[PDB]
């Protein structure tokens, strides 16, 4: 309806991007200042966060260029985990520095083309700032610890943070020689204390059945199955619905009853002590299992039931296509214990001892949910740090070192590409200035000092925003991985260049 010409498009685009960059610059890092989430279009209730990711989803935006920022933020959450807020801020910064170039006389392509060459130079610099760590078991422990503690604070939860950091690093530590998460279950569950938390060495289903059914098995034999009882997974032993009579309502209820029982028999014929079902277990087959000697767990999860099947050494039935013809799993012990004020089922003696479950114990629901997410972003990080066991010196130490790399390049160059190099270095450097405000210690002194170190060549002083001074980094509790950072640099740039390149914004609203 409206055709926004290249300049006019630039301003809307810039202002879109920037409005978003303020919110996430404040949320940033462990001392970062909170956001207030406001539910729009429906009520006006509030929640307080410090997570940059949540700002975007909860509170949307109608600016076309700002929508690109939202798409980008999604990608960090899953694949990398942490860095959802860290990216969004740098991308807005890159555009800010872009503003002065479009004005001067300088076309958008000039700025793009020279930031691509600059991204390649920054990456080379990310490798240099990346020193290997956590090759040996002792160092490997120390290595997971630093990254994981970073993540939680930046996405909210900083009170009970340390207890969860011990369990999370131990969990990844067991795996050894693979970055699985396909055995490390994450269970968030009501009951327990906020201080206590538990890692069972095995696998743990938090689903229970009371003390009215068996729960004590020694030398357990596992059948993993998806068996309907009312859902009615195939291997029917009931009837079709037909209507021929006014008493026919009675006939249906009975026919379901023979169905439930004939399926109990087929399960029974495996020769097992522990039966797990993703689906419902009706009141009638439940009692028939408790009598047979077989444990009943109903309402198992789609993630956990499958994931259980691998570790224990079973195999799933897959919609009850295997009624006696699927191989078992085995565990040494099945004990019911009370951890918190809950009853849990504890699989122990699991075949692949890689498997662990991390059980989060809330006593405020607001904490328990936010904690699950922030800890999941952290475990995404952890498992990539298996593939390459190295860290970079975080804190603003890397950002300056990429900025500087690109400043020395910038100097060499006098062409069209050279222009944007000046812009690119400034953009990277503008991130510690944000970290400096978050500290609450004036930016100009710190960032200038930091700058000085890295020219001479040093990555053994960084910014401590936890002391408000320029300090050592020697793999402390405030470094960042290489894993998170490579992806964060790549995406910020990539997003900004797509925003630059779109200047033929036709809005038909």
């Amino acid at each position: 309806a409206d055709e926004e010409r290249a300049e006019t498009a630039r301003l809307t685009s810039f202002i879109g991007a920037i409005a978003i960059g303020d919110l996430v610059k404040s949320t940033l890092g462990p001392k970062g200042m909170d956001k207030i989430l406001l539910s729009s279009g429906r009520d006006a209730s509030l929640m307080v966060t410090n997570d940059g990711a949540t700002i975007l989803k909860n509170i949307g935006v109608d600016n076309p260029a700002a929508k690109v920022l939202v798409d980008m933020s999604r990608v960090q959450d899953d694949e990398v985990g942490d860095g959802t807020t860290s990216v969004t801020v740098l991308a807005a910064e890159l555009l800010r520095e872009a503003e002065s170039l479009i004005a001067k006389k300088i076309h958008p392509q000039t700025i793009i083309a020279g930031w691509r060459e600059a991204t390649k130079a920054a990456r080379e610099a990310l490798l240099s700032s990346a020193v290997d760590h956590g090759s040996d078991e002792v160092k490997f422990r120390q290595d997971l610890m630093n990254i994981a503690g970073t993540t939680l604070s930046s996405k909210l939860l900083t009170h009970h943070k340390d207890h969860f950091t011990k369990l999370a690093v131990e969990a990844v530590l067991r795996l050894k020689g693979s970055g699985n998460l396909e055995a490390i279950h994450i269970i968030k569950k009501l009951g327990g204390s906020l201080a206590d938390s538990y890692l069972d060495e095995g696998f743990l289903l938090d689903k229970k059945i009371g003390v009215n059914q068996p729960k004590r098995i020694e030398n357990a034999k596992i059948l993993i199955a998806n068996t309907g009882m009312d859902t009615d997974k195939i291997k029917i032993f009931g009837s079709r619905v037909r209507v021929d009579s006014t008493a026919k309502v009675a006939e249906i209820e009975h026919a379901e009853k023979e169905k439930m029982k004939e399926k109990v028999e087929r399960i029974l014929k495996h020769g097992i002590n522990c039966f797990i079902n993703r689906q419902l277990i009706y009141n009638y087959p439940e009692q028939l299992f408790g009598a047979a000697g077989v444990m009943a767990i109903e309402h198992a999860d789609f993630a956990g039931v499958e994931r259980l099947a691998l570790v224990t050494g079973g195999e799933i039935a897959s919609t009850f296509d295997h009624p006696e013809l699927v191989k078992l799993g085995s565990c040494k012990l099945i004990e019911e214990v009370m951890i918190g004020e809950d009853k849990l089922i504890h699989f122990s003696g699991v075949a692949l001892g890689e498997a662990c479950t991390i059980v989060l114990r809330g006593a405020t629901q607001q904490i328990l949910d936010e904690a699950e997410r922030s800890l999941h972003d952290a475990l995404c990080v952890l498992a990539q740090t298996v593939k390459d066991s190295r860290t970079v010196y975080g804190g603003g130490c890397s950002e300056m070192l990429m900025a500087h790399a690109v400043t020395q390049l910038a100097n060499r160059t006098p062409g069209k590409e050279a222009v944007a190099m000046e812009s690119y270095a400034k953009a990277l450097r503008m991130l510690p200035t944000i970290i400096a405000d978050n500290a609450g210690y004036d930016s100009a002194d710190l960032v200038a000092q930091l700058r000085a170190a890295h020219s001479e060549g040093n990555t053994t002083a960084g910014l401590d925003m936890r002391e408000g001074t320029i300090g050592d980094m020697a793999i402390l509790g405030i470094t960042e991985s290489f894993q998170v950072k490579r992806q964060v640099l790549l995406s910020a740039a990539e997003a900004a260049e797509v925003i630059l390149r779109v200047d033929n914004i036709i809005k038909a609203a």
Binding site: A1, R5, P64, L500, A508
Partner: protein, 517 residues
Amino acid sequence: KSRLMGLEALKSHIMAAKAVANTMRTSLGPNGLDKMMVDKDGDVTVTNDGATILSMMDVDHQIAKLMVELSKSQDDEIGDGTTGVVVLAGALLEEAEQLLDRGIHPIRIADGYEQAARVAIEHLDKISDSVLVDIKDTEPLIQTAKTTLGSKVVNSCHRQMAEIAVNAVLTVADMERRDVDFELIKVEGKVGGRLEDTKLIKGVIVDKDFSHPQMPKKVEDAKIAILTCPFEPPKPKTKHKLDVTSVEDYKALQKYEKEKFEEMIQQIKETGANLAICQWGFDDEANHLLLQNNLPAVRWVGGPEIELIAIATGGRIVPRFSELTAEKLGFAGLVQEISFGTTKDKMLVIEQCKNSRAVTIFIRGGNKMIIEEAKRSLHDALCVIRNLIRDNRVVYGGGAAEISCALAVSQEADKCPTLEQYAMRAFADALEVIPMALSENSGMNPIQTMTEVRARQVKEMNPALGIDCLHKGTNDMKQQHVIETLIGKKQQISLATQMVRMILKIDDIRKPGESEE
């Protein structure tokens, strides 16, 4: 009432065209800057090409409405240069306005544009070759492949997508005349793999129906039994339950399904073929039984989907189960089942070496955004080689051809004078807008870069030496590797001129206030 009369009406038109023109101008060449369309649901899309962007765009004026039609013809034959016709058409008017202010009528210039188009084409024909063969057009097609990929979905050559793209078009050309359409070739995309997972399909690809990932998957023969009749009892695209009123009739209904599996399996076998395409379906249990019995069905085939296979094979679909003979079925040169997606179920490829009238190149994609861009490159590729088959010529285009023609048309203004003089002057600068705005979007000054190439037009003619179109320090078009078809650039010249001829026609600037509703 309100009335924009004569001159006033003409001024209005000029304002519409230059705004449309400029959006297109900053999208010229692979140094182009992308288009983002936001709709009325706020759904964001990234596209490129003149033709597509206009079509989505709600027309706000008269010249805007005219351009959409114009663009779509450029898109069908040529498949590139869609944005470049538009830039030229609006540009030429932006100069006509300047002529108007001097005191020349739009009438005088508009006749001399038609003449100035005629002289531009003439000059074009001298530029580059006009003789190739189809095992030697391939090196320009590789030059077309660099630019076309590397401004859309990727910023790089991908040799796999390009080479798949060019074969498909050749399969249809040798069946009739050395001519192909844009309805005999298609890019069908289905998400599951990555953009580099691709196939060359020589006929068509249909989803192959499998009830479960424990049922057998076989293929055999080289021939397709195209049916609408059953290959196992129907269930013809509507809900059904079971309407038995005894236990007895349920038990009865299962054995009757067993016999019909066998009997259809044999009837098809006997004629030849054993993979069936049936328009109708049947529930999940009956299908599972037939897959176990072996000799795979395809069940739940669209009403369009069957028409697609038939047109490509050239044969017919039986209306009945009675009437079956090998003649009455369509003819394939191979049927083989290929893994669609990279973690998804197998599909059925029906390649044909018998007859071809629909050759699909099967592209896989991840997201909805990345597939739509990737197919955008494909469409443009199908079209440039369509021009070659019919008559084999290429031109160096990107800036090279336009400027060389421009200098030529300029020179004749001063050989001729009279009526066409002003028209020639304006036409020669219009042609030069095309390399110019390409440098505007790109990293380097528009005036400076235009001046550079113009120097080498006096020093040498018929140049492989245009402006940068890989964003380089050097400027060529042999080392920037942009090639257009000679006919393709030729078709632009016609089209731009055209727009001017259409606005001239009547004198009905009278409006009741209805003129863009």
